[PDB]
């Protein structure tokens, strides 16, 4: 077994197919599935892994009460090979309300922040064993990426933030040899709030496009350089925005240095990628909701700032049903890396009150150098029926 | 790892033993199965998987109701060793209402058919990630064989089907060679109608047997060469026919060319292989329905259509007991290579009304050529009292 | 890999010390578990793993309804590591109402009868595959050992009867190759009502004690010649009887070459083995019903007729209890071969009313050189709490 | 494969990181889960596992009314990969009301203990077979570690004890290769009541602190060495007392050699270790009942008697709620050997009436040379809502 280096160039993308759909809260309705949130992918040299952050009971159960909640003790991360729900057989890799995983070619790490909301840890799981651990550093739930992190020769980052959800924060880029935090850098350049990055490796440095929780509806990019721990950012040009809440298509501009001061405050984790000056997005299709998924390439949209020339549109979910996070994940290919992405599907509290829990399931597309057609695949469970 | 050659002869065959049974229904009537419909199995070198289309549903569940319905986006391609039954830990391989599975030796191809009835996505997947995908080529439900495809020297084939059920359609035969398209050839020769293609090896080409759903009750007969692409197309010559509808013993005939354009409309998943100048295959009991399952051998069935000939008769499922689909797999021994089959036992909706749902189980023979006796395999659960 | 040859002397024996419990009735009142019956143990070189019987229904489910009934089309072989109960992911190996298997050192072999009563079909599977199968000779419930086979050098041998349960039948010794039968002897030498075999490796030979369920109680013994295919027979001497039903221990008597002719009518599947001169074995604690289970070591037992001296009781199963089937297995050791056993514990119709269902849970012991002390391990459940 | 010699250094260790946690009392409110007592935790090379004492029942379930009984037949030894939850699909690996286990570097050992209270018998298997076997020698209650044995360069050790819970009591350390009890030595030292050691390795040797159910809150030690088989034994000098119950922190005390007599009484498993000539070792919050749980280290602890001299606390269940048994394990690093261990929460009878039944689940935490920060991780079910 080698170390992973990515060292290959990217494939070409004219889109995405469909790869995988998990149907969890349908199932839940007759079987004994695990109440998550906040899942992602990530897949090692053979094959693909999904997680999740699951709630430390299961739905039909009286425990799924009130699990509207982000941060309790019983929380931990989920790990199943892909395309198979979250069971009673599913394995629980650590406590975590805030994870990240990555495969370096030869083990998994595993990133898992647990406790105090002003005195959380952070542990640092690799090859079946914790081998470090930090504190909190600004005392203001810490947390991370909740998709996968990067790991290249031996080497693996992740991206750390502590501090405000609405003012100056203190992120942090974590540099990690089997298990061991040999480096930390800290957030440097023009990017302003900066959390749950959506990371992929760029040969010979790896790429983040995160959520900007404060500002900005336009999405920060953070780049890493691997060798000499070097850290630059700004943020995402396009003219079409990234997150949500939003203005609309018309009203709508960005900036590729600030944010850009556009219903700014909140925010959903998303993702993006650069081919050449295009940029590959995807975004929820409801301006101000978490409604509807959509992807699309904006052309000039890496480097033109007042580019807003979109092609290859896909609806992945229909505007009249509920998406969440979405996040990429990378797949080495035979001559080429492929890009992919997972759409979190929330349902359940606050949104939806004829239940008295919040669940999700999800639907996985990967990058295409074919062709595809169109389709809509929502989560699809009937609450009205749904556990009494 | 050496990639599958087929290049033994077939092994003699003088009827089929039992093999597999899975009790799918009436497990559900106390346990989580999932609901399913368009099984098949298919084996690595080592052992043989069972493949169904599922449901995104339990059998005991509110979205059981309507399961008769064939595409939905929650539908999935379940993936299990033979013998274990579809349970909450199956794995869904990719996003699918219609499929085909075939190992090549090294690793799993799967082609999964999804979205839109007008505007469809075949996407290829290949040792666990996504190589490849295809847009309907005529805008009328794309659909491929629901049973495994063929691999030869790293090369493996899939018949896909787009356009009308019931008139002129435009079939394809796809080359795929890890998980890339290499070629596209088009359905040729004097198969009018072409749709769930049954294919086994046949060194050094693949054979096919399939279902004409538009004026013929004998079955047409697909050729692929694998080396210069080209295809030739028939019909099964056999007097005795094996589509359902058809006409009785007494009132069907044949033609080796052309559909016998008895009873032609509609059609049922079946399958057939050649042995010198006689055919081996399978059929349901009834004429006009699908209850019961019995297979033969028709003497000079392959290349005389006059024959009626058959010897060596066994009733898998009695006729007063429902059926379904089948289809073939090949399963390489010592020193040669065997054919088995598998048949869908379809229970509920909309024949039984004593239920909300539709589903199956199955049961699966192999080629022997020792000896045998005789009985019935049924799915027998009784749906008078299954779940409310 | 390499074959097994078994050429080690067999262990020293001074009792038997506990190894498995799986406590399946007890469990499936609160969980989805299968009803079985005809357990039985067999290991491959690393690891043990437990078969049985399944009815094609779990316990809390409408189908358990009957399941008294030993011929059924839904009934086929599970198969799970040693200690995991059968629960909704179990492995069905084949379809089976009577079955034996074995590991050769590379692979497993399964020798599985399903069919009509006065047809049935053995088929025979190994390493994944059906490799051959044999009619019903003489048209009257063709059965086998439902406990391991014995394979040497390659060379697998089983033992199967057809015919009358209360007469003269016929019963076969097959040799079988990578799941071929290379050669058939019939049975031979003084024993004269065989069934059920419980067998193990006495090399260069395979040794067997059946059960008579005609004129004896106490047991056959074959002995098989492996190279020549030669078969003798005889019975166990030792003046304490193992078959059930039988005469008291002070009304008792045996012969080393014919049926003792005392209420040999009916039996039950148990075991025995040879330690110089003198015969380990268990039997029912009740002389007349399958109730309580206990082993001893008859002095001189195997060599003398009149020898009613036993040593080394344990109780296994305390006489209130319910009992059943049991029979043989060998592990081989460091230097040596171990024998060990497994019992049936039977639950439900006829002889309990309270339920409707009739399952099993099973319990196994191993040889042991070292010391032990005393107990009882039955079943354990409390029907007048099961289901309605 | 070579065995394991634990031959590098103890890490630093500057407290503990959260590593583990299952939730299964909070699951078994909604899904199939056994009832346990008594957990570990140990690894292979590769990863760890959660292993327990099973009740032979689940939770849901009429058969878990009374599991507060410690000792009977249908008690099992449960394994798990560590995170999996204890479902209907886990192993039950041996018959055992009392038990340890632990890998060689090349196998399994278990050590089991199951029978009559007054004749009860130890079994030992290696490699998934039954390899030795010893008899309770003072006829009142066998019993073992209740964690992980530990392995150097082939020779496995165990701490056995039979007799009085409340007097003088008969204990041995055994020596094992490939399963097989090679000698066996008697306590020897100063320490006077010895149960359920928490035993890890301290190369040249082994070093274990158990529970002195007789005259000591504070904890016994023992030396073992693993060349000549000799033993020496002791108490834990901090004078800050790890056992429950004990007198309050400002009125208990300790002595290096004997029992301090202070609420000697009864007692719980735990652990402790040695950095230098400090101690770190964990308890419970309450010096009485078994509430809350706690770890530090003790400034010169380990080697004077009079220090009460704490840093570094965690608060790992808070002091109103329920915790239970705790113990250590130990894994390799690069370069060091870490300690972890783990923390039994008991819910149910007899503390607890709102429900009939016993169980726990459990939390894992890891040593760690880095930082942290606080938190608390109870057990989190609602037995109020429980199935009544
Ligand atoms: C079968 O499946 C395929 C694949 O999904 C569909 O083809 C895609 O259709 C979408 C939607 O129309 C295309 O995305 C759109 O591209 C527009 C560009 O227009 C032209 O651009 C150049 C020339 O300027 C030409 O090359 C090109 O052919 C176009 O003529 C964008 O302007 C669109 O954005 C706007 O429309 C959407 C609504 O659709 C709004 O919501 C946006 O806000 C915005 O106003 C859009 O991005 C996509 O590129 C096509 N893909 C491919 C690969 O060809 C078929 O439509 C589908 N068929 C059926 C019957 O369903
Ligand atoms: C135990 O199990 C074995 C194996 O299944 C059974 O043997 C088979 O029995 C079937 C049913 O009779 C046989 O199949 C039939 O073959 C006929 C062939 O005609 C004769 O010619 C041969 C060769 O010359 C002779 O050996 C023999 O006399 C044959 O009879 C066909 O004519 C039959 O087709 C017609 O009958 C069926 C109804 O049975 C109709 O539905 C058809 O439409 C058609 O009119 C039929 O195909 C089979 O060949 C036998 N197999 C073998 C391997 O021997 C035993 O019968 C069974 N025993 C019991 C008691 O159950
Ligand atoms: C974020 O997370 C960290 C890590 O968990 C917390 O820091 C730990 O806090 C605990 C408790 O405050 C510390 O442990 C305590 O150590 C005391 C001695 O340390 C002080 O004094 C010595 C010598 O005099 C100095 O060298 C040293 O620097 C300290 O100033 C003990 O006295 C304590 O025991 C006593 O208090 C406890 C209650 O805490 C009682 O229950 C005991 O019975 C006893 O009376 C205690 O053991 C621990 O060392 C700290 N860890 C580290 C790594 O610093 C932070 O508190 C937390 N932040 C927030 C905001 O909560
Ligand atoms: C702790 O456990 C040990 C080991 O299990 C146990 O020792 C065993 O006790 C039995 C019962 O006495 C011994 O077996 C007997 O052997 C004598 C010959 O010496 C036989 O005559 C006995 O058979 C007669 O009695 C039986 C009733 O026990 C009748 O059922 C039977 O029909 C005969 O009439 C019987 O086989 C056995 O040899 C020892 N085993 C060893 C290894 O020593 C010990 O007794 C237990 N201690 C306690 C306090 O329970
Ligand atoms: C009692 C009450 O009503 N309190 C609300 C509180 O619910 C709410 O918090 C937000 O609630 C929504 C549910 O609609 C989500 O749960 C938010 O969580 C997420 C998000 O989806 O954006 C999920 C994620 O788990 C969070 N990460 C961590 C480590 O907690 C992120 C995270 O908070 C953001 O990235 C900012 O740091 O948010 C959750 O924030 C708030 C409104 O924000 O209002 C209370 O009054
Ligand atoms: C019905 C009743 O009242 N029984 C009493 C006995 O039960 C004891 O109850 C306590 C909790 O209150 C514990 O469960 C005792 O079990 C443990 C323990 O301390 O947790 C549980 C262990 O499984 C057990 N190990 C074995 C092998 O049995 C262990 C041992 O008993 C001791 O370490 C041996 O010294 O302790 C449970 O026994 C109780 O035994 C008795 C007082 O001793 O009082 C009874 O009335
Ligand atoms: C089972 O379903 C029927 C049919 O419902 C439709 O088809 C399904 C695929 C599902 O997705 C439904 O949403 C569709 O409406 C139900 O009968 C219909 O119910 C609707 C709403 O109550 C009603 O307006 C229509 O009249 C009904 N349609 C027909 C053809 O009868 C029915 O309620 C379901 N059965 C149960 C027990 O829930
Ligand atoms: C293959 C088979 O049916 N095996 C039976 C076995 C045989 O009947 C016997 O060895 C043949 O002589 O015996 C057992 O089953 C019993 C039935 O045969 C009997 O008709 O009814 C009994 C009702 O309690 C019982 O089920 C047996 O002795 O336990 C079981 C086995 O499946
Ligand atoms: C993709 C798809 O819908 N396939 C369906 C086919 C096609 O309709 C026919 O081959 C005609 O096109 O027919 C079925 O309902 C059937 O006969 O049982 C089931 C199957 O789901
Ligand atoms: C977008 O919404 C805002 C409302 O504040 C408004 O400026 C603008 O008119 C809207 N644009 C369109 C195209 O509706
Ligand atoms: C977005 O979602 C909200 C929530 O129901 C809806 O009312 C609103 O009209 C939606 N807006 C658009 C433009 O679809
Ligand atoms: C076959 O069908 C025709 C009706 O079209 C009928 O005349 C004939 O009797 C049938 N044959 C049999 C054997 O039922
Ligand atoms: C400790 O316990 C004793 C019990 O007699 C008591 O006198 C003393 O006050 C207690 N001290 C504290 C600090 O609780
Ligand atoms: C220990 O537990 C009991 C439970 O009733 C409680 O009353 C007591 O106060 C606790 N001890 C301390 C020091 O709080
Ligand atoms: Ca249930
Ligand atoms: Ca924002
Ligand atoms: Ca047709
Ligand atoms: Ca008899
Ligand atoms: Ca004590």
């Known amino acids: 077994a080698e170390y992973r280096n990515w060292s290959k160039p990217q494939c070409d993308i004219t889109g995405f197919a469909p790869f995988s759909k998990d ?26 892994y999904q997680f999740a952050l699951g709630q430390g009971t299961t739905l ?32 629980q890799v650590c406590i975590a309300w805030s994870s990240s995983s990555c495969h370096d070619g030869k083990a998994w790490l595993h990133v898992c922040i647990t406790g105090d909301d002003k005195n959380a840890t952070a542990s640092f799981i690799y090859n079946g064993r914790l081998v ?4 909190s550093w600004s005392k203001e739930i810490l947390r991370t990426q909740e998709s996968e992190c990067v790991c290249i020769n031996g080497t693996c980052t ?64 953070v780049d890493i350089n691997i060798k000499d721990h070097s850290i630059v950012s700004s943020y995402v040009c396009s003219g079409l925005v990234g997150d ?36 590959w ?10 409604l509807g998924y959509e992807t699309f390439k904006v052309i000039e949209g890496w480097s033109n700032p007042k580019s807003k020339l979109q092609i290859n549109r896909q609806v992945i979910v229909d505007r009249g049903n509920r998406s969440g996070y979405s996040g990429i994940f990378s797949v080495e290919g035979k001559s080429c890396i ?14 939806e009150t004829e239940v008295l829990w919040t669940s999700n399931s999800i639907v996985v597309f990967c990058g295409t150098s074919g062709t595809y057609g169109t389709g809509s695949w929502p989560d699809g469970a009937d609450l009205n029926l749904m556990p009494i």
Chains 1, 2, 3, 4 share one sequence.
């Not at 349908?26 to 992918?41: F, H, K, N, Q």
């Open 158 to 221: 992740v991206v750390m933030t502590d501090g405000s959800a609405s003012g100056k924060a203190d992120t942090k880029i974590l540099f990690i040899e089997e298990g061991k935090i040999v480096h930390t850098s800290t957030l440097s350049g023009s990017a302003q709030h900066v959390e749950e990055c959506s990371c992929y490796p760029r040969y010979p440095g790896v790429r983040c496009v995160c959520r900007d929780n404060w500002k900005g509806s336009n999405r920060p990019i």
């Open 132 to 135: 470090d651990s930090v504190v």
């Open 281 to 290: 997005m995807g975004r929820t299709i409801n301006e101000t909701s978490r």
């Open 338 to 351: 492929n890009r992919c992405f997972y759409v979190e599907l929330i349902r359940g509290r606050k949104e």
């Open 60 to 91: 039909n159960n009286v425990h799924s009460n009130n699990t509207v909640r982000g941060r309790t003790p019983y929380r931990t991360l989920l790990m199943n090979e892909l395309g198979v729900p979250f069971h009673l057989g599913t394995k």
């Open 244 to 279: 949500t809440p939003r203005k609309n298509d018309s009203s709508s501009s960005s900036h590729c240095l600030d944010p850009n001061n556009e219903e700014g405050g909140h925010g959903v984790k998303g993702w993006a990628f650069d081919d050449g000056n295009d940029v």
């Open 23 to 48: 149907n969890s809260i349908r199932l839940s309705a007759g079987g004994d599935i695990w109440v998550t949130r906040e899942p992602y992918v990530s897949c090692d040299p053979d094959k693909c």
